[PDB]
Amino acid sequence: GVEAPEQLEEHGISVYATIPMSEWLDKRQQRHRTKNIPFLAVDNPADSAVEAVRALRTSLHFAMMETENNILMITGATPDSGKTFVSSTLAAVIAQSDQKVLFIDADLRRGYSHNLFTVSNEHGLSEYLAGKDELNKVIQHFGKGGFDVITRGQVPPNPSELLMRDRMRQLLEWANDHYDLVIVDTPPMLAVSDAAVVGRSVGTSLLVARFGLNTAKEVSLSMQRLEQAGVNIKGAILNGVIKRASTAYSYGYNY
Amino acid sequence: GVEAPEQLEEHGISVYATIPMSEWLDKRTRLQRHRTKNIPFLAVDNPADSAVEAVRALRTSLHFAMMETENNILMITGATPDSGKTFVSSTLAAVIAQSDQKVLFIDADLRRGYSHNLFTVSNEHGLSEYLAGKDELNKVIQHFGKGGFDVITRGQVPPNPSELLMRDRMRQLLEWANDHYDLVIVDTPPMLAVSDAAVVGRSVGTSLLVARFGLNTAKEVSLSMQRLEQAGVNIKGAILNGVIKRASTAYSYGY
Ligand SMILES: [Cl-]
């Protein structure tokens, strides 16, 4: 188990941000509206988890200085890292700054951001890459967050083959000229190569490891493998960080 | 003066909405550190306000009117100066954006638009710079954080306002925009002040005229719709804005 920012620095891994977990988020005469609860970034802006994401923004602001490419790929070591939380909150935070952001859910097998943004999943990433849908037909707007999104679409029979099609390249090149920041949420590296095939058309790449769940080893093993591939892995993010119990104990099995 | 909708229906002028005045804003209202970067924007501040509910109604009427008519450009002009045309269009922009819709707002009042001041965004690269061929499209499209929609400001006042609107990039812009946004709102200078609305109106698919409660007369309004007619511009109707119930009067004027 990780649990400590410096517990990564020692491995040489640079941590762009440490994000604590929100407890309020676990608690979770006509007029007509839409969408459902809950989106932390807009609901509780003062939240401690959100304030940290802003610090994540300030970090990328520098980091992402003169790289020409404005596509930032977010991925995790393994499943349940809270990477979708980090990425979606980052999108909201950056957009809120008067910035044009495009969020794409590249987890063609298990992306669920359509549920989080309470948006349709009929036309998404898979339909486009397969050639069924034109680009403008798969880009929708997440009202509550104030940014544009592309859901995963209907789970395809050939996830990986689709990610390698030329259309993924056309999309990122196109997207890079129309948005100030393009966030790509991808499957964990320790689960599929997908992040390596897409991480190769991106300027930045941040791996998100969860406090306690991830062993500082795999976060290096993940970055290492993305390095074998042309992927330009910058640092890492420590998500989950939960503290103050006045004792001495945690969790993390040893392999 | 003029107060209806009935007084408007009379001259055949079809009224899509009646927006009451907002006392909550008349006062300007105002219900650590690191603050925002804007000013009071009713649509997101007091959402349940009666002026915003009126706009929602406008949305509904516009939805039926803009029923399978394909062209998604909506031009909102006024009969005369200070008719509240910007409060109306900016509010509608926000409302429609919140329904998970990609919207583009453009200030086509190259001489007195102030929407950049309202959205408190930059005004160095705007419509005028783009129309003159100086700037590029992606350069002039910015994002309004609070509202959640994309905007294009006027830019620096050009020496040849009208000549630029007849350009060619105006059309080129509008049709390009029509393919990347679900809704395109174009704010134009008062019809009885310049010919601009009629030159731009020839590329919009729908047009609305906003008349102010008490300041306008059922005369000048139908006169504007008429001269827009001569130019071959789809003027679907009008909007009564400012309506302040529970009151009286104390002015004077006529023609
Ligand atoms: Cl996840």
Ligand SMILES: [Cl-]
């Ligand atoms: Cl294009």
Ligand SMILES: [Cl-]
């Ligand atoms: Cl005006």
